[PDB]
Swiss-Prot record, chains A, B:
Cofactor(s) named in the record: FAD
Gene: 6-hlno
Entries under InterPro entries matching the protein: Amino_oxidase, FAD/NAD-bd_sf, Flavin_amine_oxidase, Flavin_MAO
Summary of activators and inhibitors of this protein: Inhibited by (R)-6-hydroxynicotine. Inhibited by high concentrations of phenanthroline. Activity is strongly affected by Hg(2+) and p-chloromercuriphenylsulfonate, but not by N-ethylmaleimide and 5,5'-dithiobis-(2-nitrobenzoate).
Functional pathway: Alkaloid degradation; nicotine degradation; 6-hydroxypseudooxynicotine from nicotine (S-isomer route): step 2/2
Taxonomic path: Bacteria, Bacillati, Actinomycetota, Actinomycetes, Micrococcales
Protein name: (S)-6-hydroxynicotine oxidase
Keywords: Alkaloid metabolism, Cytoplasm, FAD, Flavoprotein, Nucleotide-binding, Oxidoreductase, Plasmid
Cofactor binding note: Binds 1 FAD per subunit.
Superkingdom per UniProt: Bacteria
Protein source organism: Paenarthrobacter nicotinovorans (Arthrobacter nicotinovorans)
Cellular localization per UniProt: Cytoplasm
Reported impact of K287M: 10-fold decrease in kcat/Km and kred for (S)-6-hydroxynicotine. 6000-fold decrease in the kcat/Km value for oxygen
Subunit organization: Homodimer.
GO molecular function: (S)-6-hydroxynicotine oxidase activity; nucleotide binding
Length: 425, 425
């Protein structure tokens, strides 16, 4: 049969499948859906005929992501410097200043203090060890309660909250402080670095690299949703919705953490993992592309709106543009366009909304979640364990990366590790 | 005779003398020079007839200095908000920006890192304990060597150095890193706070408060330089240059640390103090007032010039102003006016120097030093010990304050303590 079956056709799965193959193994890639890429997804725009857009993962930074840089280099995939912001319309109160960093000096001493406390806590985290193994339980509290102890003033406090909401894709009352600290550590112990790293984009979309990687996997089955994995025997048996079983010495689960509860594992996974695997992670990130008329180029807005961030995405024509909001799907209904007009108009009262485009990750059975973000309490109970092997079954993907949790990079990184675990044994 | 003699007629000495008196004791104040105030010294300007100027200590901040605030409140001494800076002519390289905080974002991540390390080290310091008692010897190295390990880029690195030079009144190769960290801690663990606190001035000069305080001391002898203090007997004997001895149960030395080596103490001071008392501290701060024509109002310059800082001091007329440079007297000769024109012109090539005014603290036998700043090594050998009693002799003054070393505030603070030590016993 096969040396490995890889379940799931996103970047994690794609790298694994290609790497083992180049190692000379016999590998099958099984993809539940009708395309490769998973949460990296360029398509043509619902709003603008002829325009290609990223409806998932978009932004990379080469100094922060060596594994991604080399893929881009390996296949000559051109990147482009992401949108430079030149025009600032914040909702941060009358003392904010319209710059990218809108903190007034009247606030500077407080920022300098809070920055120190913030980074002091982040320095507690050792990245390789896992969040559940370090006595961090005091920090796994709600983000809003934590940011209350920083004694921050209006502009900087609200600025902090807005970006955290955008990044974590959770309202402050649901986001774990520990997890915010984790993203800080992931970035070489930089708060600033967490935002300064959405920095480049693919010039022809993520689909570019998706194709390069697949042009090198020989056996791929789309529309093949896995429903069971069984390793009670000498050889792992992988069973499928409408179709037969496939068999292998080794199985890589490269599907989203929040999907693992819909698969039947034999034996059942280790007791420690089950509860969290059941509940899933709390990530509710929601990314909406907005077709607008009237917006000038290079707009950036941060503020206390239901959209925390709203900024320039693309030029369409000289009257028209796409913008991007982030916010979360628990707090917002993207199908109430009335609400969208309100949210936008809040920052930019002179602009007309022509239409919106997005994908509803949380509702896609193939995904069930956008990017990972633990619920409060979850990742100090179990975290590193989640992406650890259970027998001959391996778990990879951004959702479980310890080094770069959440990013294309971490999908690439958890794969390399599995490929190694297989190759060595 | 007297319950106390206070030696030295600066703020430290003035508060003591007044406080003991109000306690009802019998107190003599002995002042070596021809005025009261010491290193707080307003006079009429050498350059501008009719203009009153501060040739010593000038700047206060009420939130940072409760002891000073209450003096000002006690006597209704009016302050004025110090010069707001509106115009910026830095020498920090082509990427600096002409703002008060001239760091470019291209530099921001590095600043955020360095700020963290800087404050982490400063948090090692416990203020009450004394610098010699905490295992800080690793930090008592030269400032330039320390600032090399922060890996700072041009603008921020040079900005940091310029303000440190100004503050410590020492070139980077002679200043102790530990001492820079000490000023950071003194300020509630704030780097920013070290400069944001030169913030108010006396509207009628420091002489205002000097008079208020003396209007309440009943026995004062000027031109009375002390040369010996002897406590071998039952009652302390204090002997004078051209004149008799005075006697007291208790003596307060409120004269500058760098003068104590010219006094004969019986018995000799404790072995630990003697070496440092001999060498004196390394402070070489030099403050020059420059009368100029052509300068616009509100100028501030920071840079890599021989003047680290050069900024607006006062308006004179609509063509004329005073500015203030700081720099150090080891590195600069203020009697080479050619050099002064060069230093100024470096930042402001369009401006004409009319004249300069300053006092040469380091050369004044009554002072022998401007503000305190240890030499490298000194204050981790002995620091708290220096301002500790030796028998019935007490040492006060800014030079020895642990809480606010260097400031009028710390002169007020070390006095309160002595007054207490005397009263309790
Ligand atoms: C809105 C949004 C914006 C983002 N923006 C960025 C960004 O700017 N920068 C960045 O670095 N990252 C970004 N990300 C994160 C990044 O996209 C993902 O975390 C990463 O691409 C995940 O890749 P993966 O290989 O781990 O999982 P996925 O790409 O999710 O791949 C999992 C695959 O499994 C398949 N699958 C699911 N169930 C089964 C089944 N049982 N059987 C077979 N196949 C199955 C799915 O079809 C999918 O193809 C963003 C994510 C979202 C949701
Ligand atoms: C240029 C300069 C600028 C400054 N700027 C500021 C500022 O902006 N803000 C701030 O808070 N602080 C500032 N300071 C610091 C502050 O002025 C001093 O540290 C503080 O005033 C010292 O007061 P003191 O009472 O300890 O000593 P001093 O004021 O120095 O008093 C000592 C007194 O002892 C007398 N004396 C010396 N020898 C004898 C002798 N043997 N017998 C009798 N009397 C003797 C002297 O005449 C003097 O009056 C500045 C200092 C300088 C030099
Ligand atoms: C004893 C050692 C001496 C060391 C001192 C070094 C630094 C002292 C510099 C003090 C002057 C800063 C003034 C603030 C600017 C201002 O008032 O005017 C403001 C500009 O102020 C800012 O934008 C500052 C933003 C906050 C930064 C906080 C980060 C702290 C990092 C510490 C940096 C350390 C130095 C670098 C190594 C103009 O718009 P606004 O008035 O509407 O807002
Ligand atoms: C996961 C949690 C998310 C938390 C993220 C929160 C903060 C992210 C904000 C990122 C955008 C900053 C961009 C820098 C501005 C710029 O490029 O453009 C610059 C303005 O930049 C600056 O002046 C910044 C000065 C340096 C500040 C360093 C202090 C760090 C303190 C940390 C602050 C923490 C937030 C407050 C709590 C304009 O002139 P320039 O291009 O010629 O220079
Ligand atoms: C845990 N990872 C949180 C970051 C989520 C994420 O990758 C992402 C990337 C870009 C953006 O604009 N918002 C969120
Ligand atoms: C140890 N104290 C260092 C600060 C020296 C000092 O008090 C001072 C005050 C104002 C100024 O502009 N430069 C120096």
């Amino acid at each position: 049969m096969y040396d490995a079956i890889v379940v799931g056709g996103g970047f994690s799965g794609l790298k694994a499948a290609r790497d083992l193959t180049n190692a000379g193994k016999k590998v099958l890639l099984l993809e539940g859906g009708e395309r490769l890429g998973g949460r990296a997804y360029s398509r043509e725009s619902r709003n603008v005929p002829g325009l290609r857009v990223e409806i998932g993962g978009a932004y990379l930074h080469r100094k922060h992501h060596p594994r991604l840089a080399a893929e881009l280099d390996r296949y000559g995939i051109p990147t482009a410097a992401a949108s430079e912001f030149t025009s600032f319309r914040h909702r941060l109160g009358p003392t904010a200043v319209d710059q990218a960093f809108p903190i007034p000096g009247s606030e500077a001493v407080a920022v300098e203090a809070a920055t120190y406390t913030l980074l002091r806590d982040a320095h507690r985290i050792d990245l390789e060890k896992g969040l559940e193994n370090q006595d961090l339980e005091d920090l796994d509290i709600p983000l809003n309660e934590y940011v209350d102890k920083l004694d921050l003033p209006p502009v900087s406090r609200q600025f902090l909250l807005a970006w955290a909401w955008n990044m974590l894709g959770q309202p402050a009352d649901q986001a774990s402080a520990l997890w915010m600290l984790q993203l800080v550590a992931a970035h070489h112990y930089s708060i600033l670095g967490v935002v300064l790293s959405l920095d480049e984009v693919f010039s022809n979309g993520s689909a570019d690299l998706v194709d390069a990687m697949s042009q090198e996997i020989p056996e791929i089955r789309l529309q093949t949703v896995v429903t069971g994995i069984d390793q009670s025997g000498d050889v792992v048996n992988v069973t499928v919705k409408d179709g037969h079983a496939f068999q292998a010495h080794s199985v890589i689960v490269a599907t989203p953490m929040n999907t693992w509860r819909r698969i039947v594992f034999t034996p059942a996974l280790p007791e420690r993992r089950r509860s969290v695997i059941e509940e899933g992670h709390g990530g509710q990130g929601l990314k909406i592309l907005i077709h607008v008329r009237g917006a000038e180029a290079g707009i950036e807005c941060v503020g206390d709106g239901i959209f925390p961030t709203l900024y320039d995405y693309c030029e369409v024509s000289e009257s028209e543009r796409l913008l991007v909001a982030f916010t979360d799907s628990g707090s917002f209904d993207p199908t109430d366009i009335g609400a969208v007009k309100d949210a936008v108009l809040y920052y930019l009262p002179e602009v007309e909304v022509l239409g919106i485009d997005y994908h509803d990750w949380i509702a896609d059975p193939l995904f069930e979640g956008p990017w990972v973000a633990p619920r409060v309490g979850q990742f100090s109970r179990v975290h590193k364990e989640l992406g650890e092997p259970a027998g001959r079954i391996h778990f990879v993907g951004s959702d479980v990366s310890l080094e770069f949790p959440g990013y294309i990079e971490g999908a690439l990184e958890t794969a390399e590790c599995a490929v190694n675990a297989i190759l060595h044994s």
